[PDB]
Design a protein that fits this description.
0% helix; globular; mainly beta; 3-stranded antiparallel beta sheet; signal; cell membrane; SH3 type barrels; lipoprotein; 55 residues
Length: 55
């Protein structure tokens, strides 16, 4: 329930909510920290990390 996005160029983008891989557009959609809807070329994304939360 805490997603992290790894980019092919090394960056380790934190996010708010689960990103969206649209294979129909070749785009990954996401919200960052300031409530901003963003889009990044799927191609520049290498991994989608879900960090499970535990009580």
């Amino acid at each position: 329930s805490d997603y992290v996005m790894a980019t092919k160029d090394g960056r380790m983008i934190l996010t708010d909510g689960k990103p969206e891989i649209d294979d129909d557009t070749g785009l990954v959609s996401y919200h960052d920290q300031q409530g901003n809807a963003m889009q990044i070329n799927r191609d520049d994304v290498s991994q989608i990390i879900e960090r499970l939360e535990h009580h």
